[PDB]
Amino acid sequence: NDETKALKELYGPVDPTFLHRFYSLKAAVHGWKMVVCDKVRSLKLSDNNCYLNAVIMTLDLLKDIKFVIPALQHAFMKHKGGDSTDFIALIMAYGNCTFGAPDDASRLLHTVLAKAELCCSARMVWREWCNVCGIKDVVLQGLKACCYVGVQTVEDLRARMTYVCQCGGERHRQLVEHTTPWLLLSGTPNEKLVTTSTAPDFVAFNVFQGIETAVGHYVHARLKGGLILKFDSGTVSKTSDWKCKVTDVLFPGQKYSSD
Amino acid sequence: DLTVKMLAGNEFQVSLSSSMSVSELKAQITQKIGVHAFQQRLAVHPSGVALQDRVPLASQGLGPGSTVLLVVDKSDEPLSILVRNNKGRSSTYEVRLTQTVAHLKQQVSGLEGVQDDLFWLTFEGKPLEDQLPLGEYGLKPLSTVFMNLRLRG
Numbered sequence: 001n002d003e004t005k006a007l008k009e010l011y012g013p014v015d016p017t018f019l020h021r022f023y024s025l026k027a028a029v030h031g032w033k034m035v036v037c038d039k040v041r042s043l044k045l046s047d048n049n050c051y052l053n054a055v056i057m058t059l060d061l062l063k064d065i066k067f068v069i070p071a072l073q074h075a076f077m078k079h080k081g082g083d084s085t086d087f088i089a090l091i092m093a094y095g096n097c098t099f100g101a102p103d104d105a106s107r108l109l110h111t112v113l114a115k116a117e118l119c120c121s122a123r124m125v126w127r128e129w130c131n132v133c134g135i136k137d138v139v140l141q142g143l144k145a146c147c148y149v150g151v152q153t154v155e156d157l158r159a160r161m162t163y164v165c166q167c168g169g170e171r172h173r174q175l176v177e178h179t180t181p182w183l184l185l186s187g188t189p190n191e192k193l194v195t196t197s198t199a200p201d202f203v204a205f206n207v208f209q210g211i212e213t214a215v216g217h218y219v220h221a222r223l224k225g226g227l228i229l230k231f232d233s234g235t236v237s238k239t240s241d242w243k244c245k246v247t248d249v250l251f252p253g254q255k256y257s258s259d
Numbered sequence: 260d261l262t263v264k265m266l267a268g269n270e271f272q273v274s275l276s277s278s279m280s281v282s283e284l285k286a287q288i289t290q291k292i293g294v295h296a297f298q299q300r301l302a303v304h305p306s307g308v309a310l311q312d313r314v315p316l317a318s319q320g321l322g323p324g325s326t327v328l329l330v331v332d333k334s335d336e337p338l339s340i341l342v343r344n345n346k347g348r349s350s351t352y353e354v355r356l357t358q359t360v361a362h363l364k365q366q367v368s369g370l371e372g373v374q375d376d377l378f379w380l381t382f383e384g385k386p387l388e389d390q391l392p393l394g395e396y397g398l399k400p401l402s403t404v405f406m407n408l409r410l411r412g
């Protein structure tokens with residue numbers, strides 16, 4: 001009927017529990033606050049929501065994104081206008097997150113971005129080849145050219161990758177052209193020593209603290225004013241050097257080609 | 260406000276000269292007729308030419324004043340793919356492009372001994388969404404899917 005069609009337009013294809021979960025999360029996260037730290041908003045720690053601090057503060061760095069699901073875009077707009085409750089509950093709902101339960105910031109971040117599109121240009125070109133099957137270029141446009149799960153440095157992104165071809169032989173692919181407004185790389189928690197004597201090539205990153213087989217804690221970090229800013233769920237401190245397990249790394253616009 | 264023909268042989272209209280994405284068209288088709296984009300074969304009526312990939316839309320078709328044809332490729336023949344796990348072990352699986360990501364996860368959860376919602380999958384850098392079919396991701400014979408643990412923080 002008309003009502004079912006409208007919910008479909010509004011939230012897109014969702015499971016039968018979705019609307020109940022959304023509305024319950026909406027009520028449940030009503031008390032959460034977005035607090036201003038160093039002139040930016042951070043999600044105040046509550047009910048194990050640190051992974052949402054990471055996700056929210058990362059999205060806020062991603063220029064020219066827009067959500068293709070209308071309720072999500074509206075909530076996103078409201079969030080930017082300073083009322084974040086809807087956006088938070090909605091991403092929890094799309095993420096199948098449970099209130100008060102700890103979760104995975106990278107899984108959520110890329111689940112959310114899968115519903116988004118880019119309002120500007122972006123392009124990857126990959127060269128793939130097989131000794132038997134030959135060579136083909138693969139072009140990729142928009143938001144998908146701006147994210148990669150599986151590596152955390154640009155050089156690992158640009159390295160030759162080996163896998164198995166359709167034909168049974170080994171196949172290779174490798175990035176040979178890349179133009180983006182930004183670049184989000186994500187991987188498993190990975191120990192890096194981050195220093196600011198020389199400005200790192202990335203502009204922000206997220207950190208998992210603790211053993212990965214237990215419940216840890218997330219911090220969102222930004223490189224600013226020659227320093228590292230650590231946004232720990234509503235609070236912010238500053239350091240120069242930091243040995244930490246990095247998860248998501250955000251880089252600036254890419255502009256690369258390989259002859 | 261377009262319109263698309265099938266072999267029912269019935270039709271219906273895409274209620275939009277808007278948004279415009281061939282894919283959204285597909286998705287429009289997807290959610291209008293419950294048919295997965297990767298099985299959709301589009302061709303402008305009646306010049307059976309079956310379209311570019313770039314932006315909406317013409318090229319060779321535009322406005323409420325045209326029509327396009329839709330045939331569904333009903334092929335879900337089995338194929339073998341790989342899923343490589345947390346430690347770097349790849350195990351073969353028989354699948355159909357028609358099964359959901361969630362279904363493949365049930366398989367993997369089976370062979371790995373990890374609750375299906377305690378991990379997530381990627382293919383060539385991209386995350387696989389539970390509700391979508393394997394065919395959405397251009398999975399090929401012997402494609403390698405990666406298993407990532409769902410951390411808790």
Ligand SMILES: [Zn+2]
Pocket residue numbers: 130131132133134165166167168169171
């Ligand atoms: Zn080959």
